[PDB]
């Protein structure tokens, strides 16, 4: 049962900027199998109004999903993406740098 | 220039937790129009693009009948392979399938296809001549013998050649203001002083389509191909895409580095430096 | 338009 | 434990792909419910309230638009009790085969379609497709014969069905299948009429 | 399986009761044996060695003193082999009818037996007997038309065979029969000569 680890990118739909509304995305690609836990965090923990695009794959058969959720970030607030998969030893969290 | 319509099916089994989870999505180039989820409280076909939503009930329903019917088949296909390879009864698996059709700017078929994979591993595929198969292993051979005796190519071919195209025309036509347009990237550069005397400058190109784009860094007019750091293209999450390239630079001498963007929405490639406030 | 499902794999 | 009910299919056992069939379960016993169960590739059990009327306690199970999964071996039971179900003995076995999923085979009669009584006749189904087994049915005959195929032999795959001393004529049809999926058959071979002189 | 042989009867298809007829089976193929088979209630098969010579292989089957049983549909086959016989394809169908078993019908030509060219002629057979169908033969060596009997019509059971624009004259004869036994015909109607001016 061949496996592949998930590349991960955290970002906002539109150029981030305090006080404004935006979406917090987490694009997980190239993983396999599909079964996967992808959680969006707000200052340390899980948010509830999270959604994910429809499961689809690439040419190399790898999958890919886009998690997101509306959100109005602050200079104070921190957001991160937590990801779990069989291929990983433990949940790999990835902070959100609005500059990247 | 040329467009294509691609379908992506995923049939995942779950020995204990129930029955095969079937999912299917359809794209016309980098745009997705259909989605179908075997688990939804109401398993039915759903629109994901304006153009294809303009259609009516018969359509959406005839399409749903296909999806419902597909899954029902992959269900058996799974249980089948699980035997072909003689595997655990409670050992999960997956069967992916990709098929669609490429056309010329004039229409007309360039290349059509249809290929499956078992556990992310190339299984069987319809050959380019649309009349034969290429089994990855002995197991898939069984499939072929059956499929050859069932004339699947003869039929699958007819769709790839026939309707796979016609549909794409229809979709291309109704969504011309999207699929056949361009939507150039709104570009800019961010200045982030990294370490004493050094600064990082990123060239952003967002909300564009197709996702195919090119971003380059030039210092004094010479390609920095070697030190240009850039992330893989990601979806804005609203149908458009993102991407950016960056290079470390000696403070002050920033203005020597210019960014270069090449997209289809751009008549002429874009060149841009950082614009230091005032 | 999606392909018409045929025979099981 | 009550007497086993009777189970039959209309129009018949072989169901053409897409097409639908009805397996009816009935008995003089006033069963409150009937359970239809098929075993195999994808076992399943269908519940249904009994219909008491016309001197019979029946229940007509509609086996949806025929395909892959639906094919297999069915058996029904009835029960006086509800909720728990006090299942009766199993009805006789009914092999519901799905047909028409593969190239038609060719059916021939050596020495020939017409023969003098007593003489030995044998039919044979060949095909370019690699069926592993062939099935021979005689018009209105309950059970179907089944021999194994004869591997790659200069263009085909055969199977000869000896019929012994010819006494009664008849129309026969062949079907081919594959090991892994025994309830999945090909298209019927053009009917062959055997005539005895 | 060889090509089918040719089958013909001499003098002809319709045999008068008591009278005899011969059905001959032949072909270019050197069949060592010829099998003649009659199908129906009194089905049967007559064996016979082939007569080789003049490049042909024949066999003359003599259908004995004609009567009820003998009448029906015949077909023959040949075979080069013995013991197991390797029957050929069936010769074309030959309906051997027995006649002269019922009252003679009356044949008439309205407007009349003699008519001017182009003019429309139509023959008709009436009879006290209630035959269900009638047969019209021209010179008995031309054809066999067949219409159903028309309900009671001023005293008789008729059947009118339109002949359309008269162009050639001819002798016609009528025959009556009954549904159940289509190979059983009455006595010929006195020949009627049609003349065109």
Chains E+A touching (3+ CB pairs under 8 Å): no
Q: How many CB atoms lie within 10 A of CB B168?
A: 24
The alpha carbon torsion through A24, A27, A33, A38 (nearest 10 deg) reads: -20
Please list, in sequence order, all residues whose beta carbon lies within 8 angstroms of the beta carbon of residue B191, skipping any fewer than 6 positions away. B199, B200, B201, B254, B274, B276
As to burial, measured by CB atoms within 10 angstroms (0-12 exposed, 13-18 middle, 19+ buried), residue E185 is: buried
Give the residue on B whose Cα is nearest the Cα of D100. B150
Residues in chain C with CB shorter than 8 Å from the CB of B166 are 1
E49 C-beta neighbours (distance < 10 Å), count:
11
CATH superfamily entry for domain D100-197? Immunoglobulins (2.60.40.10)
Q: What is the dihedral of CA A80, A85, A87, A91, to 10 degrees?
A: 40
Size of chain D, expressed as the number of residues it contains: 197
Method by which this entry was solved: X-ray
Domain extent at residue A11:
1-100
3 state SS of B173? helix
Q: What CATH number did the domain enclosing A3 receive?
A: 2.60.40.10
Beta bridge partners of E137: E173
B34, B70, B80: residue with CB nearest C5: B70
Q: Provide CB contacts within 8 A for E69, sequence distance 6+.
A: E42
Kindly report the nearest CA distance between residue A28 and chain B, in angstroms: 10
- The DSSP bridge pattern shows strands D14-16 and D94-99 to be parallel
Q: What token pair was written down for E125?
A: 């057979």
| Sheet with strand B244-250: strands edge to edge | B186-192, B198-206, B244-250, B229-230
**Of residues A27, A15, A65, A25, the one with CA closest to residue B185:** A15
Contacts for B273 with CB less than 8 Å, ≥ 6 apart: B189, B254, B255, B257, B258, B259
**Which residues of chain B lie closer than 8 angstroms to C6, CB-CB?**
73, 150, 152, 155-156
Q: What does each C-alpha distance from B82 to A35, B64, D180 come to in angstroms?
A: 19, 27, 11
Across the interface, do D130 and B145 touch by the CB < 8 Å criterion?
A: yes
Residue D122's nearest CA partner among D142, D108, D137, D138 is D108
Contacts of D17 in chain C (CB under 8 A): none
- Whether residues B72 and D67 touch (CB distance < 8 A) is answered with yes
For chain D, after which residues does the C atom lie more than 2.5 Å from the next written residue's N, i.e. where is it broken? none
- The answer to whether A4 contacts B8, with C-beta atoms less than 8 Å apart, is no
Containing H/E element for E145? strand E145-148
CB pairs under 8 A between A and B: 76
What CATH number labels B182-272? 2.60.40.10
Q: What angle (nearest 5°) sits at the alpha carbon of residue D37, between those of residues B66 and D15?
A: 50
Both tokens of B273, joined, read 């430096």
Of B75, B79, B146, the CB nearest to D178: B146
Cα-to-chain-centroid distance, residue B193 = 37
Q: Which residues contact D83 (CB under 8 A, 6 or more apart)?
A: none
CA-based nearest residue in chain D for residue B84: D180
Please tell me whether the peptide bond between E195 and the residue prior to it is cis, using omega within 30 degrees of 0: no
Cβ atoms within 10 Å, residue B8: 21
Cβ-based neighbours of B195, under 8 Å, separated by 6 or more: none
End-to-end CA distance of chain C: 21
Domains in chain B: boundaries:
1-181, 182-272
DSSP A97: -
Residues 6+ apart with CB under 8 A from D197: D114, D115, D116, D117, E35, E37, E45, E77, E87
Give the integer Cα–Cα distance in Å for D78 and D125. Answer: 41
Q: Which residues numbered 174-233 in B keep a CB inside 8 Å of some CB on D?
A: none
Which residues of chain B have a CB within 8 Å of the CB of A63? 10
State this model's resolution in angstroms: 3.0
Those residues whose C-beta lies under 8 Å from the C-beta of residue A46, and which sit 6 or more positions away, are: A39, A40
Q: How far apart are CA B79 and CA E121, in angstroms?
A: 77
Q: What contacts B137, CB < 8 A, 6 or more positions away?
A: B123
Give dist(CA E163, CA E173) in Å, integer. Answer: 14
Q: Which residue of B has its CA nearest to C1?
A: B167
Locate A41 and state its tokens. 């965090």
The residues that bridge with B12 in the sheet, in sequence order, are: B21, B94
Q: Which residue of C has its CA nearest to B145?
A: C9
CB pairs under 8 A between B and C: 53
How many domains is chain A built from? 1
| Architecture field, domain E2-99 | Sandwich (2.60)
Q: CA of A37 to nearest chain B CA: how many angstroms apart?
A: 16
CATH architecture of B1-181: 2-Layer Sandwich (3.30)
User: Are the CB atoms for B248 and B198 separated by under 8 Å?
Assistant: yes
Torsion-angle region of D40 (φ positive above 0: left; ψ -120 to 50: alpha; else: beta): left
- Output b/e per residue, A60-83; b: 16+ Cβ within 10 A: ebbbbbbbbbebebeeeeebbbbb
Q: B43: buried, middle or exposed (CB in 10 Å: 19+, 13-18, 0-12)? A: middle
Cross-strand pairs, D108: D124
CA-based R_g, chain A, Å: 14
Burial (CB < 10 A; 0-12, 13-18, 19+), residue E42, is: exposed
Between CA D80 and CA D176 the distance in angstroms is 42
Q: Which of E3, E61, E85 has the highest number of chain D CBs within 10 A, making it the mutation to test binding with D?
A: E85
Those residues with Cβ within 8 angstroms of residue B140's Cβ, 6 or more apart along the chain or in another chain: B84, B118, B123, B124
**If contacts are CB pairs under 8 Å, which of residues 21-80 in chain B contact chain A?**
23, 25, 27, 32, 35, 37, 48
What is the 3-class SS of chain D, one letter each residue?
A: CCCCCEEEEECCCEEECCCCEEEEEEECCCCCEEEEEEECCCCEEEEEECEECCCCEEEEEEECCCCHHHCEEEEEEEECCCCCCCCCCCCCCEEEEEECCCCCCEEEEECCCEECCCCEEEEEEEECCCCCEEEEEECCCCCCEEEECEEEECCEEECEEEEEECCCCEEEEEEEEECCEEEEECCCCCCEEEEEC
The shortest C-alpha distance from D137 to chain B (Å) reads 21
Domain range summary for chain D, segments of one domain joined by +: 2-99, 100-197
SS3 of residue A93 by DSSP: strand
Question: Residue A80: left (phi > 0), alpha (psi -120 to 50), or beta?
Answer: beta
By the CB < 8 Å criterion, does D164 face chain E? Answer: no
Which phi and psi (to 5°) does residue B162 adopt? -75, -95
Between the two ends of chain A, the Cα-to-Cα distance in Å is 34
Check: CB of residue E123 under 8 Å from CB of residue E39: no
Site from E46, E61, E87 to mutate, D interface, most D CB atoms within 10 angstroms: E87
The Cα B83–Cα B91 span in angstroms is 11
Under 8 Å between Cβ of E144 and E97 = no
Interface membership of C8 toward D (CB under 8 Å): yes
- By Cβ distance, the residue of D111, D113, D197 closest to E35 is D197
Q: Which phi and psi angles does B142 have, rounded to 5°?
A: -50, -50
- For residue B64, what is the enclosing H or E element? helix B57-84
Tokens of B242: 């993102």
Of C1, C7, C8, the CB nearest to B163: C1
In this structure, what token pair is assigned to residue A37?
Answer: 């836990």
Cα dihedral A78, A98, B242, A10, rounded to 10, equals: -30
Residues of chain B whose beta carbon is less than 8 angstroms from a beta carbon of chain C are 7, 24, 26, 34, 63, 66-67, 69-70, 72-74, 76-77, 80-81, 95, 99, 114, 116, 123-124, 143, 146-147, 150, 152, 155-156, 159, 163-164, 166-167
Nearest-by-CA chain B residue for D105: B149
- D contact test, residue of E31, E73, E84, E91 with most D CBs within 10 A: E84
Query: Is there an interface between D and A (3+ Cβ pairs < 8 A)?
Result: no
Alpha-carbon distance A66 to B239, whole Å? 12
Chains B and C: 3 or more CB pairs within 8 Å of each other: yes
CA distance B220 to B227: 14
């Amino acid at each position: 049962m061949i496996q592949r680890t998930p590349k991960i990118q955290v970002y906002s739909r539109h150029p981030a900027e305090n006080g404004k509304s935006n979406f917090l995305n987490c694009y997980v690609s190239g993983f396999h199998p599909s079964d996967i836990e992808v959680d969006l965090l707000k200052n340390g923990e899980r948010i509830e109004k999270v959604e994910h695009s429809d499961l689809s794959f690439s040419k190399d058969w790898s999958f890919y999903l886009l998690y997101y959720t509306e959100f109005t970030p602050t200079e104070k607030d921190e957001y991160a993406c937590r990801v779990n998969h069989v291929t990983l030893s433990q949940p790999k969290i990835v902070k959100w740098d609005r500059d990247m | 220039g040329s467009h294509s319509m691609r379908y992506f099916y995923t049939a995942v089994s779950r020995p204990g937790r129930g029955e095969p989870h079937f999912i299917a999505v359809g794209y016309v180039d980098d745009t997705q129009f259909v989605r179908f989820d075997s688990d939804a409280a109401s398993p039915r076909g759903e629109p994901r693009a304006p153009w294809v939503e303009q259609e009516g009930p018969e359509y959406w329903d005839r399409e749903t009948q296909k999806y419902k019917r597909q899954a029902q088949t992959d269900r058996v296909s799974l249980r089948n392979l699980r035997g072909y390879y003689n595997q655990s009864e409670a050992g999960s698996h997956i069967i992916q399938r990709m098929y669609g059709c490429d056309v010329g700017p004039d229409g007309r078929l360039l290349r059509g296809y249809d290929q499956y994979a078992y556990d992310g591993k190339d299984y069987i595929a319809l050959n380019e001549d649309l009349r034969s198969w290429t089994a990855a292993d002995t197991a898939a051979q069984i499939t072929q013998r059956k499929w050859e005796a069932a004339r699947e190519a003869e039929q699958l071919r007819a769709y790839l050649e026939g309707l796979c195209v016609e549909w794409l025309r229809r979709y291309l036509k109704n969504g011309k203001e999207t699929l056949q347009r361009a939507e150039h990237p709104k570009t800019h550069v961010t200045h982030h002083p990294v370490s004493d005397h050094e600064a990082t400058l990123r060239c952003w190109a967002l909300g564009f389509y197709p996702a195919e784009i090119t971003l380059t860094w030039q210092w004094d007019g010479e390609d920095q191909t070697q030190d240009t750091e850039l992330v893989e293209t990601r979806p804005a999450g609203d149908g458009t895409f993102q991407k950016w390239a960056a290079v470390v630079v000696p403070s002050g001498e920033e203005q020597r580095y210019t960014c270069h963007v090449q997209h289809e929405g751009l008549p002429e490639p874009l060149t841009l430096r950082w614009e230091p406030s005032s | 338009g999606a392909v018409d499902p045929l025979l099981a794999l | 434990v009550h007497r086993k009910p009777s189970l039959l299919a209309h129009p018949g056992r072989l169901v053409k792909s897409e097409e639908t069939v009805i397996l009816q379960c009935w008995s003089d016993v006033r069963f409150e419910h009937f359970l239809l169960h098929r075993e195999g590739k994808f076992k399943d059990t269908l519940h249904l309230i009994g219909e008491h009327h016309d001197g019979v306690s029946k229940a007509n199970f509609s086996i949806g638009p025929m395909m892959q999964d639906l094919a297999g071996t069915y058996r029904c039971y009835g029960s006086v009790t509800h909720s728990p179900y006090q299942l009766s003995a199993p009805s006789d076995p009914l092999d519901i085969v799905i047909t028409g999923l593969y190239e038609k085979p060719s059916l021939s009669a050596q020495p020939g379609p017409t023969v003098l009584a007593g003489e030995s006749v044998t039919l044979s189904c060949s095909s370019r497709s690699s069926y592993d087994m062939y099935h021979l049915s005689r018009e209105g005959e309950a059970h179907e014969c089944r021999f194994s195929a004869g591997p790659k032999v200069n263009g085909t795959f055969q199977a000869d069905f000896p019929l012994g001393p010819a006494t009664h004529g008849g129309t026969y049809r062949c079907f081919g299948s594959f090991r892994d999926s025994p309830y999945e058959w090909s298209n019927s071979s053009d009917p062959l009429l055997v005539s005895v002189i």
